[PDB]
Design an enzyme around this catalytic site. Structure first.
Site, PDB file in Angstrom:
ATOM      1  N   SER A 114     -34.418   6.667  -6.660  1.00 23.85           N
ATOM      2  CA  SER A 114     -33.674   8.052  -7.250  1.00 23.85           C
ATOM      3  C   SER A 114     -34.706   8.471  -8.380  1.00 23.85           C
ATOM      4  O   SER A 114     -35.230   7.519  -9.082  1.00 23.85           O
ATOM      5  CB  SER A 114     -32.454   7.709  -7.688  1.00 23.85           C
ATOM      6  OG  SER A 114     -31.671   7.365  -6.617  1.00 23.85           O
TER       7      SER A 114
ATOM      8  N   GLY B  93     -27.021   6.961 -10.890  1.00 27.91           N
ATOM      9  CA  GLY B  93     -27.336   8.475 -10.578  1.00 27.91           C
ATOM     10  C   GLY B  93     -26.283   9.517 -11.276  1.00 27.91           C
ATOM     11  O   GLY B  93     -26.118   9.022 -12.204  1.00 27.91           O
TER      12      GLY B  93
ATOM     13  N   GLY C 132     -29.862  12.749 -11.875  1.00 29.33           N
ATOM     14  CA  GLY C 132     -30.539  12.854 -10.524  1.00 29.33           C
ATOM     15  C   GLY C 132     -29.607  12.626  -9.151  1.00 29.33           C
ATOM     16  O   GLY C 132     -28.365  12.831  -9.318  1.00 29.33           O
ATOM     17  N   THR C 133     -30.000  12.066  -8.270  1.00 30.07           N
ATOM     18  CA  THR C 133     -29.343  11.603  -6.980  1.00 30.07           C
ATOM     19  C   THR C 133     -28.936  10.182  -7.172  1.00 30.07           C
ATOM     20  O   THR C 133     -29.479   9.508  -7.820  1.00 30.07           O
ATOM     21  CB  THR C 133     -30.202  11.928  -5.814  1.00 30.07           C
ATOM     22  OG1 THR C 133     -31.566  11.182  -6.160  1.00 30.07           O
ATOM     23  CG2 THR C 133     -30.886  13.383  -5.815  1.00 30.07           C
ATOM     24  N   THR C 134     -27.853   9.872  -6.185  1.00 26.11           N
ATOM     25  CA  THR C 134     -27.252   8.642  -6.408  1.00 26.11           C
ATOM     26  C   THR C 134     -27.818   7.614  -5.301  1.00 26.11           C
ATOM     27  O   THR C 134     -27.662   8.167  -3.864  1.00 26.11           O
ATOM     28  CB  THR C 134     -25.708   8.554  -6.077  1.00 26.11           C
ATOM     29  OG1 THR C 134     -25.234   9.544  -7.304  1.00 26.11           O
ATOM     30  CG2 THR C 134     -24.976   7.285  -6.187  1.00 26.11           C
TER      31      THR C 134
END
Lengths: 233, 243, 223, 245, 250, 205, 204, 245
Positions: free
Chosen positions: H75, H162, H30-32
């Site tokens: 996240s 992430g 995913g996203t950090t």
């Protein structure tokens, strides 16, 4: 395999997408195309009304939900109806109780929760419908993209329904022109009819059953139908 | 056997997949605990597994304070340990509200034992893989160790050990309790009992332990308290400077 | 009625009268007021006979259940809490005024409960209509340090004081001694401080004044 | 998932009756026998006791014979467990009728409530049916003696002699032949005791391996007096018929 | 959440079998030796209470429970199943006979209640039976002395003498001869000890054996150290010391 | 409907001193004019370092307090040790929703080691009020002048001990529904110390 | 209106020796006008006899209830209902309805089937159990009844002489009423025959 | 396909059901987001991915408040995050009304925590699949907590997650080690920006928008605020300095 992540709302993937989300994304495309663009003082929806039978009569498929809010659909119409039903109720309860006029982001968040409860029981379900919601509040103009996947981004421009990519590429280019043009309707409306004609490639464009809907600072919610779209083709 | 994972039916074996695997998975955190009772104290020493420098070394806990007297060590995965901890904390307070008397170890054991049995009977809840070691110096039952295991079986113990190295620890406790001819520690001062405990633990697990490798909870008559980093150090210090 | 409680250094003693009245006329000389909840919780009851018996039995069934469930001795402190909450819930529309006493490995206990939803602590306590005379005797001759013999003796003098100066209280006196070492000794009719009443003799009715309109028979089972 | 861990068997077979119901019938035919004979001066009930041994208490034979009323009693064929739930509800239903209309429950009225629940058990919930058949013995003052049977299929009929549980065919065949309507209690018992013999293969049949009751007119009632025999009373009648078996 | 397993988890076949029950009956056999003798001069129950670890105490383990002051119970099978069913059995005994009818329950009628719970947890979907068989022993003036078994099936029967758990067939047999109609309670304690001696050795001492009797009692614990209203409850369970002492004279 | 009603000693206080708070009370229950209790424990622990004085109706205060006791036990185990202000709210909530049946005059006074000693006074009808010291009941108006003038922060334990013994012993004399023992509760970080002085003692002293 | 003295009623129970006696009136009114000389208040369950005084509606409702309880008890147990047991079940049914209506004074009489001894017990609307083996009375004229019985009764009476005590106690108690006229019955109960004897007495 | 992948109405042989394991795997692709604990506060930062010029800068926000002094960023799966927060609010408000105080971070953690555990013991109720970095300041200090899918939570002093986790964690531990815990709140903003900028190097086929916030006892005066204006320009300056620019 199929039967692991289909109908089963309780499962997960290492990727986090189930089969039920990918089908839902496909379902949006099988509705008619509708494009969104906004400045900072107006938000426009241009939507094609194209009948699906020979004898069928044209009817509105952009629905005004409140004085400062509406949505257009692309995807499944029953799925679209229940949500619109809950949102009209929600609009009222905020106005009576808190006097609150909704921003798009807030409604959106509500919308995600609703789908979420129905993806935590086998007897409920996920949806099959995307929505572009426009509204003008005191933070300017807004256009939102709602997805059944719960991904909500407020955008300057987008398109959903079939053949999105024609319009997206045009919309990202005329972006810079349109956002700095404030207090002028007609240019943003005209540009929306051009965008949607790049979505079409082989499907008709109708000169009296197009329906354009606008909201803004100087515009309360008006859908232009019939005659009144002429001077923007 | 049976086919316990698809329907809640019995096995001719008597023991089901949910019970059998709950017996296994209770260690994957690389943990060992023991509890001994003094003459007039009860001591728990437990391994403390701080594996990183991204974590504070004293938010990592595995010993919970359920009541003001009662302590509970959970040997299991941490979500299951907290699920058990939450329920145990309510039942402990609810019992005091209604019956006017704080919770003893054996009654908490019983409540939870009954719950674990019901969730095995259900097809609409999962049971947990937790071994709950409840300890105190109860007012009527004396020094107490009562340990529950998953199944919904529980029984009272002299002293106990948990973890893959249970066996190593056991042979040391056995040897002491036979020698002394009693099933508790002759000593009666919780310091000397804590110190003794660590001794038998070093010996069994084969590594000398630091304060950040141990976490100590002490039970005494009418109070339960946890020993801090400095407090653990003071005990350790003597074991390092005698033969 | 008159009900008392006295703590001693080795147990606790409770005492009562068992008279029930309908007007001045003595319906019953004996009728229980010391109720067994368990062999170490006995309880003396005042107010309305029907509410006191019934509600202790209600508590009793659930207490005998709790002691067993939790696998431990009965406790005064458990009964106490349940009585208060139950009387509270109904706001004292049940008129049971109890002195609950009992003995455990955790000490001697003596409490009283008002129907108001109050619980009390004291070292000698009394309730009943004979409450005012009885308390007077209790509060004066209790002194720091006490024995079985001073405690029963006190208990007796107390219930008599209430017989004498309150005349809604009579009949037999039942005592029950709960020692820490023992369990409970129920001493039925420990003092019988009042006695039967005059007869002037009574006589065969003549059959010229006793008339039967008509005669039948009916069966013992018609069920 | 767990929406496909549904057994889906309390739905119809193409055979015109539910899976589980048909299979359950088999279960009955593998448990104890009940025999019902309706006579012209009584009703005779015989049942053969399933397991009899010293380790059991042999002086008990009410293990399948319960009286629901003062003048109604039932015989069980099936398993103890299954039975008890219907017995208790029939008993209450008796008391509801008694209380509302000031009169005792007619045999068919009682039968009909029990049978609507048996059907119910598969009709609501998806749960499994019973594993019990009753043969009802009763008197009503509107038809004389009535002797009925119900099954977990919720179909019921009246008969003048029937058997249920194991060995229905064999016993029924013999019954139809010797039947009369000028039989008395004692003539029926003799008959009953012959039939039971011919379905059981033995050296001898003993009195404690039977559970027996008859519901006769009596001589302490113009009603019907229900006589529940116990082993030692079974022993006596065995002499009286001179039928040792 | 609920509503996913609303089909029963016993179903029939043309052999009429109920899956769950057959499996659960097997569990009873794999318990420890527990027995019951009615001596028709009381009732005596004995069972083994045994360690499962060297530092497990056995004086925190009982298999003998009181259900009410004068009805006692013993079992073989799953430990948990027995405690949870025992709570519910206790519940009905206390609320429905001692408040409603003001007295202790009649055994046979309590046998009907306990059966009905077990049969119920089979009839209702989503849950299983209890994998135990209980022997419920009680005394009343009206019925005499009595003993019943209630199965995992929710079936019941009375049994003059019976045994369940490991070494069931042989234990019952030896017992049947040694069982007289008119049998002295001391001899009936020996026979029980003798049987449990044949099941286990090398860990068989009298302080690991738990024996309870229906007949002799102690008034001094029933609050009748003083003048009695009545004699009161007939069940009284032995301590270890009493058991060991008799084992020497076995 | 409660038949008869009950009353308490109605001069209750929490006084701040050098190292915490010392909590002081008279105790006496009467039911009419029958002396239901000479002595009482109405010096109530709601947590190990947070005690209270209960005043108002005996039946009602005890019933509330038990509920507060359940919430603050559960509260400790899960969410960490309470504060004086945390305890005070819970007491208030229960009084306010049920002020249709409840009469509770509460001082909750507790010791914290980063707020020092704290007094929160919750009158009838229920509202949380933070004060640096309190006096409550109906006998409090009459000692308002004394209390304000001799109230001093950071006074010696010996001097506070005299001050509470004296404060009440004057209050009890002039007021009529006051009586029985004076009990006092010292709250510092070293723990909880219990004082009881009988009638014959305090009158004199 | 009246809460129970619309129709009134009185009931008396005595113990004899192997024997007990229960007697009652047969009045039915509508306020003070006596309407009928017949209305039975005494019913029995197994062999334990239950007389219930009070309002007619409340006797009827209880009588049907106690039929319901006795019958299911009888069915499970294969055994009748016992005086001792019956006392407790009456208490327990009445205390539930102390919050409901009820304006009754039942009296129970019987001989145990389990120690052969006489048994009587008394109840009020409050549900105070009156434990007695001498006499127990209930009803409107219960005060007077206590005075008559306390003087007239002598212990250890056989059916004929017992009969004379009860019959006269009830007649002279009733004579100072009008709400106890319109005929009266005495049942003298043995555990093997029950003799039912109508008395001749006043009416308005 | 074992019922340890279609149901959580059982315990697994791996002590967890497969679908919960899968939630943990989906957080990482995913996203950090990070979280930096400091001696007087906490700082939050998250990477917001830019995919089009059609998005608006800071009119879509990922860090959302609970109360007014606890800041939450998460996240992973968007819908699951809304639902977690909505709950987080209902607890927080109930606490403020009921005890008359802002809620402690170890308290707040136990309340969300017990709810993540609940949805992981039912066979048809979806697990959560977000990892939430959250925290704020209360009356005994600042606290940084991190909540996982499985209901697992501990206190952190530095936290990272992430795509760019590896990189992020490397810089982050170096700086935390160097410092007493993290030094000033102010210094930590810049540092925080470097980690997020550094993590972005692991995904240059997209752009980012740096978003920071903070909650600091004497450097926000107990409140949670967004980090903007000058304070955001400065952290950017520092970031583009070290990672060349």
């Amino acid at each position: 395999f199929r039967n692991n992540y289909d109908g089963d709302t309780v499962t997960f993937s290492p990727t986090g997408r189930l089969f039920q989300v990918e089908y839902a994304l496909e379902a949006i495309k099988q509705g008619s195309v509708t494009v969104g663009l906004r400045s900072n003082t107006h938000a426009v929806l241009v939507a094609l009304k194209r009948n699906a039978d020979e004898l069928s009569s044209y009817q509105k498929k952009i629905i005004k939900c409140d004085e400062h809010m509406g949505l257009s659909l692309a995807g499944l119409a029953p799925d679209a109806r229940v949500l619109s039903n809950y949102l009209r109720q929600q609009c009222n309860y905020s106005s009576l109780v808190f006097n609150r006029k909704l921003a798009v982001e807030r409604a959106g968040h509500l919308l995600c929760d609703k789908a979420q409860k129905n993806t935590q029981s086998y007897g409920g379900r996920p949806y099959g419908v995307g929505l572009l919601i426009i509204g003008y509040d005191k933070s300017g103009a807004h256009l939102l993209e709602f997805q059944p996947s719960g991904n909500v981004t407020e955008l300057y421009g987008t398109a959903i329904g079939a053949r999105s990519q024609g319009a997206k590429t045009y919309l990202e280019r005329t972006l810079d022109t349109f956002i700095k043009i404030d207090g002028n309707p007609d240019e943003l409306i005209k540009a929306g009819v051009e965008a949607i004609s790049q979505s079409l490639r082989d499907e008709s464009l109708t000169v009296d059953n197009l329906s354009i809907a606008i909201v803004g600072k100087d515009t309360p919610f008006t859908i232009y139908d019939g005659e009144a779209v002429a001077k923007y083709i | 056997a049976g086919y316990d994972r698809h329907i809640t039916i019995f096995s001719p074996e008597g023991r089901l997949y949910q019970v059998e695997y709950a017996f296994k998975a209770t260690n994957q955190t690389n943990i060992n605990s023991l509890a001994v009772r003094g003459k007039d104290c009860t001591v728990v020493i437990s391994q403390k597994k701080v594996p990183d420098k991204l974590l504070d070394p004293t938010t990592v806990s595995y010993i919970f304070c359920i009541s003001r007297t009662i302590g509970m060590v959970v040997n299991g995965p941490i979500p299951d340990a907290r699920n058990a901890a939450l329920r145990a904390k309510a039942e402990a307070a609810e019992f005091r509200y209604k019956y006017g008397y704080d919770m003893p170890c054996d009654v908490l054991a019983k409540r939870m034992a009954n719950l674990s049995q019901i969730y095995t009977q259900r097809a609409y809840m999962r049971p947990l893989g937790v071994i709950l070691t409840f300890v105190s110096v109860d007012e009527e039952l004396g020094p107490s160790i009562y340990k529950t295991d998953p199944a919904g079986y529980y029984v009272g113990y002299k002293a106990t050990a948990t973890g893959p190295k249970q066996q190593e620890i056991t042979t040391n406790l056995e040897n002491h309790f036979k020698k002394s001819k009693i099933d508790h520690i002759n000593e009666e001062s919780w310091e000397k009992v804590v110190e003794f405990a660590i001794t038998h633990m070093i010996d069994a697990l084969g590594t000398e332990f630091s304060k950040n490798d141990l976490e100590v909870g002490v039970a005494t008559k009418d109070k339960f308290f946890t020993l801090s980093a400095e407090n653990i150090e003071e005990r350790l210090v003597a074991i390092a400077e005698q033969d | 009625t008159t009900i008392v409680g006295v703590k001693f250094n080795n147990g606790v003693v409770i005492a009562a009268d068992t008279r029930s009245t309908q007007g001045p006329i003595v319906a019953d000389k004996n009728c229980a007021k010391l109720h067994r909840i368990s062999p170490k919780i006995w309880c003396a009851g005042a107010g309305t006979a029907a509410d006191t018996e019934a509600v202790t039995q209600l508590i009793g069934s659930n207490i005998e259940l709790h002691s067993l469930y939790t696998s431990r001795e009965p406790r005064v402190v458990s009964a106490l809490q349940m009585l208060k909450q139950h009387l509270f819930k109904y706001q004292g529309h049940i008129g049971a005024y109890l002195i609950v006493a009992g003995v455990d490995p955790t000490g001697s206990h003596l409490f009283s409960i008002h129907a108001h939803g109050s619980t009390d602590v004291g070292y000698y306590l009394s309730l009943g209509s004979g409450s005012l005379a009885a308390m007077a005797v209790l509060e004066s001759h209790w002194k720091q340090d006490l024995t079985k013999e001073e405690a029963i003796k006190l208990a007796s003098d107390a219930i008599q004081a209430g017989i004498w100066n309150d005349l809604g209280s009579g009949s037999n006196v039942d005592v029950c001694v709960m020692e820490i070492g023992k369990d409970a000794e129920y001493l039925r009719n420990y003092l019988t401080p009042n006695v039967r009443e005059e007869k002037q003799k009574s006589y065969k009715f003549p059959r010229g004044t006793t008339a039967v309109l008509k005669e039948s028979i009916v069966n013992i089972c018609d069920i | 998932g767990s929406r496909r861990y549904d057994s889906r068997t309390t739905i119809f077979s193409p055979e015109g009756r539910l899976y589980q119901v048909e299979y359950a019938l088999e279960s009955i035919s593998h448990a104890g026998t009940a025999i019902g004979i309706m006579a012209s001066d009584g009703i005779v009930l015989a049942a053969e006791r399933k397991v009899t041994s010293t380790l059991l208490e042999q002086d008990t034979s009410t293990e399948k014979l319960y009286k629901l009323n003062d003048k109604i009693a039932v015989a069980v064929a099936g398993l103890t467990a299954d039975a008890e739930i219907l017995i208790n509800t029939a008993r209450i239903h008796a008391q509801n009728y008694l209380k509302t209309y000031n009169e005792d429950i007619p045999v068919e009225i009682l039968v009909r409530r029990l049978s609507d629940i048996k059907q119910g058990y598969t009709q609501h919930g998806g749960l499994r049916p019973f594993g019990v058949s009753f043969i009802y013995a009763g008197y009503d003052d509107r038809y004389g003696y009535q002797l009925y049977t119900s099954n977990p299929s919720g179909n019921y009929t009246g008969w003048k002699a029937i058997s249920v549980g194991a060995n229905t065919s064999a016993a029924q065949t013999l019954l139809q032949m010797d039947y009369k309507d000028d039989m008395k209690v004692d003539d029926a018992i003799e008959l009953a005791l012959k039939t039971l013999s011919k379905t059981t293969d033995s050296s001898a049949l003993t009195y404690d391996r039977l559970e027996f009751a008859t519901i006769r007119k009596g001589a302490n009632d113009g009603e019907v007096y229900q006589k529940i025999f116990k082993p030692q009373e079974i022993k006596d009648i065995l002499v009286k018929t001179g039928i040792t078996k | 959440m609920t509503d996913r397993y609303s089909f029963s988890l016993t179903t029939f076949s043309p052999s009429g079998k109920l899956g769950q029950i057959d499996y659960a009956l097997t569990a009873v056999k794999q318990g420890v030796t527990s027995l019951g003798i009615k001596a028709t001069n009381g009732v005596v129950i004995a069972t083994e209470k045994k360690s499962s670890s060297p530092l497990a105490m056995s004086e925190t383990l009982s298999k003998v429970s009181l259900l009410t002051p004068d009805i006692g119970a013993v079992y073989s099978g799953m430990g948990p199943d027995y405690r949870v069913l025992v709570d519910k059995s206790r519940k009905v005994a206390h609320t429905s006979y001692k408040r409603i009818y003001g007295e202790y329950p009649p055994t046979k009628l309590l046998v009907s209640e306990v059966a009905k719970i077990m049969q119920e947890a089979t009839q209702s979907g989503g849950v299983r039976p209890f994998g135990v068989s209980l022997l419920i022993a009680g005394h009343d003036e009206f019925n005499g002395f009595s003993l019943y078994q209630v199965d995992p099936s929710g079936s019941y029967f009375p049994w003059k003498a019976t045994a369940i758990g490991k070494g069931s067939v042989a234990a019952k047999t030896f017992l049947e001869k040694r069982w007289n109609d008119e049998l002295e309670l001391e001899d009936a304690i020996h026979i029980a000890l003798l049987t449990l001696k044949e099941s286990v050795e090398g860990e068989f001492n009298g302080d690991t054996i738990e024996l309870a009797i229906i007949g002799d009692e102690n008034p001094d614990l029933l609050g009748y150290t003083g003048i009695p209203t009545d004699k009161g409850p007939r069940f009284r369970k032995l301590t270890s010391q009493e058991i060991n002492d008799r084992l020497e004279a076995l | 409907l409660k038949k008869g009603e009950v009353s308490l000693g109605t001069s209750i206080m929490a006084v701040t001193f050098k190292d915490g708070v010392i909590l002081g009370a008279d105790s006496r229950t009467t039911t009419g004019a029958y002396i239901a209790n000479r002595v009482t424990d109405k010096l109530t622990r709601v947590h190990d370092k947070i005690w209270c004085c209960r005043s108002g109706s005996a039946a009602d205060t005890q019933a509330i307090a038990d509920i507060v006791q359940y919430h603050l036990e559960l509260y400790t185990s899960q969410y960490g040790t309470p504060s004086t202000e945390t305890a005070a709210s819970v007491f208030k909530e229960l009084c306010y929703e049920n002020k249709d049946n409840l009469t509770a005059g509460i001082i909750v006074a507790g010791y914290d080691d980063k707020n020092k000693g704290e007094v929160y006074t919750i009158p009838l009808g229920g509202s949380v009020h933070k004060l640096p010291y309190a006096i409550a009941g109906s006998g409090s108006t009459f000692i308002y002048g004394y209390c304000d003038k001799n109230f001093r922060e950071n006074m010696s334990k010996e001097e506070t001990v005299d001050f509470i013994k004296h404060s009440l012993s004057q209050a009890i004399k002039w007021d009529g529904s006051s009586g029985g023992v004076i009990r006092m509760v010292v709250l510092t970080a070293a723990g909880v110390e219990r004082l009881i002085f009988y009638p014959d003692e305090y009158e004199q002293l | 209106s009246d809460p129970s003295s619309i129709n009134g009623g009185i009931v008396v129970a005595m113990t004899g020796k192997d024997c007990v006696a229960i007697a009652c009136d047969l009045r039915l009114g509508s306020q003070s006008l006596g309407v009928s000389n017949k209305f039975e208040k005494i019913f029995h369950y197994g062999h334990v006899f239950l007389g219930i005084t009070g309002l007619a509606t409340d006797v009827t409702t209880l009588n049907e209830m106690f039929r319901y309880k006795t019958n299911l008890y009888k069915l499970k147990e294969e055994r009748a209902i016992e005086p001792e047991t019956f006392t407790q079940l009456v208490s327990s049914s009445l205390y539930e309805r102390r919050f409901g209506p009820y304006f009754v004074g039942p009296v129970v009489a019987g001989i145990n089937s389990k120690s052969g001894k006489p048994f009587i017990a008394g109840f009020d609307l409050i549900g105070c159990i009156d434990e007695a083996k001498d006499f127990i009375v209930s009803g409107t004229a219960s005060d007077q009844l206590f005075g008559m019985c306390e003087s007239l009764y002598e212990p250890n009476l056989e059916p004929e002489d017992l009969f004379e005590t009860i019959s006269q106690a009830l007649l002279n108690a009733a004579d100072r009423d009008a709400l106890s006229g319109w005929g009266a019955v005495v049942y003298i109960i043995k555990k093997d025959e029950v003799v039912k004897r109508y008395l001749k007495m006043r009416q308005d | 396909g074992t019922g340890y992948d279609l149901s959580n109405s059982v315990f697994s042989p791996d002590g967890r059901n497969f679908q919960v394991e899968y939630a943990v795997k989906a957080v990482e692709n995913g996203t950090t987001s990070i979280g930096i604990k400091c001696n007087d506060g906490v700082v939050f930062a998250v990477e917001k991915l830019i995919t089009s010029k059609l998005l608006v800068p800071q009119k879509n926000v990922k860090i959302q408040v609970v109360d007014r002094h606890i800041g939450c960023v998460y996240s992973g799966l968007i819908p699951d995050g809304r639902h977690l927060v909505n709950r987080g609010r209902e607890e927080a408000a109930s606490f403020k009304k009921l005890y008359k105080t802002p809620i402690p971070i170890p308290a707040f953690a136990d309340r969300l925590g017990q709810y993540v555990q609940a949805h992981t013991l039912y066979n048809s109720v979806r697990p959560f699949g977000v990892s939430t970095i959250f925290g704020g300041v209360d009356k005994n200090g600042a606290h940084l907590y991190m909540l996982e899918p499985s209901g697992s939570y501990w206190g952190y002093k530095g936290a990272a997650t992430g795509k760019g986790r590896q990189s992020a964690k490397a810089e982050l531990e170096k700086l935390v080690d160097h410092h007493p815990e993290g030094l000033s709140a102010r210094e930590a903003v810049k540092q925080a920006a470097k980690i997020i900028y550094l993590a972005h190097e692991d995904n240059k086929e997209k752009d980012f928008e740096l978003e920071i916030s903070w909650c600091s006892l004497s450097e926000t005066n107990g409140l949670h605020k967004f980090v903007k204006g000058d304070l955001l320009q400065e952290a950017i300056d520092f970031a583009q300095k070290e990672i060349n620019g």
